[PDB]
């Protein structure tokens, strides 16, 4: 079902603090490989008052290169498909849920978003739009369907970084005892904006994400 390059198609909308929006996408990558590119397209209420950046995280699980035998909790839920609910709380009080459907309908991954964001404060950096895009990062899943953690860094103009901390539920379409669940890993990754355009009203987004146990040594 999950092929060497795969196709994907996006539908998202929801209100970050008073502020109605949806976007589209469409973009193509690598599962097995870890990489995939979308091009995105604010098609309602744009141009948004807000960084685009806060949004970033909410345009894609399939596509990351499972190293090292790690169980694949994603691909694995295929055809059934699986769904992410999160909430990102920055440090200066945004704070932005997010909740996800992922199926596959005629060989093309389809992606279903709903973002609600409060709380971001009219004159911090995201609604001055201050923002560079985000540093690296790496996020820790674990059973619990998989919970994930990650605290990202976000790049300010001036130098600097606002800090936000995500929490994360993966939840399998697929029935458990049909599932080989991993335990404890890591997806480090690199979420990067390639192109941008209209006022952040066109956006095209990359991303590589490799997953992996500790590979220092262990005493035990």
Avoid at 105 to 123: A, W
């Amino acid at each position: 079902l999950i092929t060497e390059n795969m196709h994907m198609k996006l539908y998202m909308e929801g209100t970050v603090n008073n502020h109605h929006f949806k976007c589209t996408s469409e973009g193509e990558g690598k599962p097995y490989e870890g990489t995939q590119t979308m091009r995105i397209k604010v098609v309602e209420g744009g141009p948004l008052p807000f960084a685009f950046d806060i949004l970033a995280t909410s345009f894609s699980k399939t596509f990351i290169n499972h190293t090292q035998g790690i169980p694949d909790f994603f691909k694995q839920s295929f055809p059934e498909g699986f769904t992410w609910e999160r909430v990102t709380t920055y440090e200066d009080g945004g704070v932005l849920t997010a909740t996800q459907d992922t199926s596959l309908q005629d060989g093309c991954l389809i992606y279903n978003v709903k973002i609600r964001g409060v709380n971001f404060p009219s004159n911090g950096p995201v609604m001055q739009k201050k923002t560079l895009g985000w540093e690296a990062c790496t996020e820790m899943l674990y059973p619990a369907g998989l919970e994930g953690r990650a605290d990202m860094a976000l790049k300010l103009v001036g130098g600097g970084h606002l800090i936000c901390n995500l929490k994360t539920t993966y939840r399998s379409k697929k029935p458990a005892k049909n599932l080989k669940m991993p335990g404890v890993y890591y997806v480090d990754r690199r979420l990067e904006r390639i192109k941008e355009a209209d006022k952040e009203t066109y956006v095209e987004q990359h991303e590589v994400a490799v997953a992996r146990y500790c590979d220092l040594p262990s005493k035990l």
